[PDB]
């Protein structure tokens, strides 16, 4: 995933 | 230690001191002492005026008389103080003003007198009116100043449709606003039961949906005094004792300076  | 008591208090603000040898402790509304607007809750950008000792001091209002037919008295804040020394001037020269208050209600009688006063501090005390006409109470009538207003035992509808009085019609057991008086105790309050105490002392924070507002347009707090139990003495059917209200503004600050507001009170 990509957590920003 | 030494000899101190809940009943004996001294209040000192500015050049004014109050003493009382018969108090019933004292109340801080909602557990919040009055304070100034914090930088992170601030909204007008201009440097405020804080007059301090010249406005935050004890202004005593005109004495009212409590008798066997007395149904109750009410005041609105800051309105009761609009003409009180430099507080009044600061209030009218500025668009914005916020202030907390120490309210001290005074009523002494004697060990043989009887009666109980309910002293209530109400946030946003909206009152009911005269008419078939809704929300129609005029500014001049909504704001009696120092003089305050009164309650009534029942609703007398102002009938004269041609020249309406545009006044409130505050019914006592309805707290003048459509609710029951018995429940007004959810508001910050004290009771002056004459066998117990001379006076009531309530400290009010600034309460509003905004950090600051127009004092001329809007009252923050309403003071309601009702006889929870009627005055009585020995057997004299026409007894009469004084009630004196003394109020002090606290942590008063003002924004938006310009020319003075002159409201039309006629």
């Amino acid at each position: 995933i990509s957590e920003v | 230690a030494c000899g101190y008591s809940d009943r004996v208090l001294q209040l000192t603000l500015g050049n004014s001191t109050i003493t009382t040898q018969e108090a019933a402790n004292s109340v801080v509304a909602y557990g919040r002492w009055p304070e100034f607007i914090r930088d992170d809750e601030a909204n007008p950008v201009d440097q405020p005026t804080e007059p301090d000792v010249a406005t935050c001091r004890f202004y005593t209002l005109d004495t009212v008389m409590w008798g066997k037919e007395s149904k109750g008295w009410w005041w609105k804040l800051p309105d009761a103080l609009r003409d009180m020394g430099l507080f009044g001037q600061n209030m009218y020269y500025h668009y914005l003003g916020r202030s907390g208050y120490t309210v001290h209600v005074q009523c002494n009688a004697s060990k043989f007198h009887q009666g109980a006063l309910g002293v209530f501090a109400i946030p946003e005390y909206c009152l009911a009116g005269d008419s078939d006409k809704q929300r129609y109470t005029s500014y001049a009538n909504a704001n009696p100043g120092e003089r305050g207003g009164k309650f009534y035992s029942q609703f007398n509808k102002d009938n004269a449709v041609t020249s309406p009085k545009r006044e409130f019609c505050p019914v006592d057991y309805l707290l003048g606003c459509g609710v029951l008086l018995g429940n007004a105790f959810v508001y910050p309050h004290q009771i002056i039961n004459l066998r117990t105490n001379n006076s009531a002392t309530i400290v009010l924070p600034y309460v509003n949906a905004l950090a600051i507002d127009s004092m001329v347009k809007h009252n923050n707090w309403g003071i309601a005094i009702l006889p929870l139990s009627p005055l009585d003495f020995a057997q004299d059917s026409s007894v009469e004792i004084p009630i004196t209200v003394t109020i002090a503004p606290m942590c008063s600050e003002f924004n938006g300076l310009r020319n003075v507001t002159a409201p039309k009170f006629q």
């Binding site: 957590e3 | 008591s5 509304a29 557990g31």
Partner: protein, 62 residues
Amino acid sequence: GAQVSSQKVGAHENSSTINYTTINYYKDSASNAASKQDYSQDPSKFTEPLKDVLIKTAPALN
């Protein structure tokens, strides 16, 4: 980004801690359902707004 919490189980089947899962789909927090895990506080600011709060076993007036 899934959120996992324990349910307060009322009536238990003849089968311990049971969970449920929540995922916000929208950017605006206004769009969100209610978490309903709400903390409580003291009535004291209403029941005891006194400057000198006194202990119940001692005289209210002294």
